[PDB]
Amino acid sequence: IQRTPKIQVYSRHPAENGKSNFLNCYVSGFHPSDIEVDLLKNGERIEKVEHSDLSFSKDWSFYLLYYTEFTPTEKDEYACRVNHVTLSQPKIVKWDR
Amino acid sequence: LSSPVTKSW
Amino acid sequence: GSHSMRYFYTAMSRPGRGEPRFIAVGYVDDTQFVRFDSDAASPRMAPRAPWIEQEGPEYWDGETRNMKASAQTYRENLRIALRYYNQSEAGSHIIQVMYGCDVGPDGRLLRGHNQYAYDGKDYIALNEDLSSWTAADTAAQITQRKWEAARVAEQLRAYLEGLCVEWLRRYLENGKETLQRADPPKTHVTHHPISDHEATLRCWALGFYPAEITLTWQRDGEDQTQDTELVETRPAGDRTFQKWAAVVVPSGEEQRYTCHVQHEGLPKPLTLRWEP
C-alpha cells in the first residue's frame, strides 16, 4: 500500500577536495510519489537544488535524483534530508566519500 | 513517439 | 545490442488542491528523451535529449496534443477508479502506465508492453500476445470487459508493432553516438577494517552505460549472494550509472575473495581482487 524511500547520498565523480563536483541524493522504491528532499551543507538547506522528472520502476515504485553543484572540503559536512508520508520524522543520511 | 490510444477505464 | 522504448505516465489526484497532476516521461533504454508535466507553467511535450531536438513543429505539437488528451482521460479514469473500488472523494490516488516496445539488433519487434496500475498495484496488463488481457481484480475485470467490447487490444497492437518500432528505430539512428554506445564500468576494490579480525571489501563499478550490470563476490570461487550487500544501481547525473557490492571478510583471508563484473561494454567479464 505505502512504500518508504531508499536513500543514497553520493557524488557524481570521485571526491577530491577543492575540485568541483556534483552532490546527489537518489531516492527510490517509494510510493506514493509526494516526497520532500533537501540537500544539507553543514546542517543548512542548499538553495536551487535541481531534480529529475518523476519516473518509476517495474514494480511501480518511484525514483528521483536530486543534485547540486558543490566543491568538497575536508571540514564541510553534507547530507540528504528526506520526508515522506511513511516517515514519522525526516530521515537524514550523511554523505560518506 | 507516444501511444495515440488512451481509453476510458 | 537490443533496445527498448518506454513511456511512463503518472496521474495523481489531490482533492482540494486542483485537478490531478499528469506527468509523462519517455525513454530509449536508460536515456530519457521527452517529458510532459501538467503542472508546468506552459505544459507541452519537451525535449530531454539532444537527438530529439531535431524533430519539427508537427512532432512537438502532435505530442503535446496527445499528452493533454491523455491527461484528461486519466483524470476521468481516476474518477472511474474511485467508483470501482467504493472509495471516497477525499483521498489522493495514483494511476500509473508503462508501455512500449523491445526490438532486436536487426530492429525487429522482440515484444510489446502495455501495463496499468492503480495505487501502486497491478491493475490491468496487455498480455505478450498483444490480443488478450490480464486483470488483477474484479474492477479491472470491468475495465477488461469494456476494452474487449471495443477491441482496444487491436489498436494497441497496431501501435506497438507499427509506430512504436518505427520511431524507436528512427531514434536509435538519430542518437547512434550515444544510444548505440556502451560505456564499460571503471572498477576498483576498496578495503576497510571494521575490527581487528574483520574487514569490508567493496567492489565498485562507476561511469557505466547502460544501467544493466552484474557485480558478484566469490569466496574460494563460490558465490556469496547471501552475504553480499548490494546497493541499487544509481544514476550519476551524466547519463552513466554507479553500483557497488560489499562483503565482510575475516582478516587475512582477503585474497580468497574475488569480485566479478558483467557488463555489455566489457568484451569479457572482469575478475578483480583487493590490491593492497
Author numbering:
A (entry chain B): 1 to 97
B (entry chain C): 1 to 9
C (entry chain A): 1 to 276
Please share excerpts from the published article on this structure.
The human leucocyte antigen (HLA) molecules, encoded by the major histocompatibility complex (MHC) region of the genome, are cell surface glycoproteins responsible for the presentation of both endogenous and exogenously derived peptide antigens for immune surveillance. HLA-B*57:01, HLA-B*57:03 and HLA-B*58:01 are micropolymorphic HLA allotypes of the HLA-B17 serotype. Polymorphism within these allotypes is focussed on regions of the antigen-binding cleft (cleft polymorphisms in comparison to HLA-B*57:01: Asp114Asn and Ser116Tyr in HLA-B*57:03, and Met45Thr, Ala46Glu, Val97Arg and Val103Leu in HLA-B*58:01).
HLA-B*58:01 had the most shallow C and D pockets and B*57:03 the shallowest E and F pockets. The deviation at PΩ-2 was concomitant with a 5.3 Å shift and 180° rotation of the PΩ-3 residue to fill the C-pocket of HLA-B*57:03. Structural analysis of bound peptide conformation showed a pronounced change in orientation of PΩ-2 Arg/Lys conferred by the Ser116Tyr polymorphism of HLA-B*57:03 that would markedly change the surface presented to T cells. Despite this, HLA-B*57:03, like HLA-B*57:01 and HLA-B*58:01, was more stable when in complex with peptides containing the bulky PΩTrp (compared to PΩTyr or Phe).
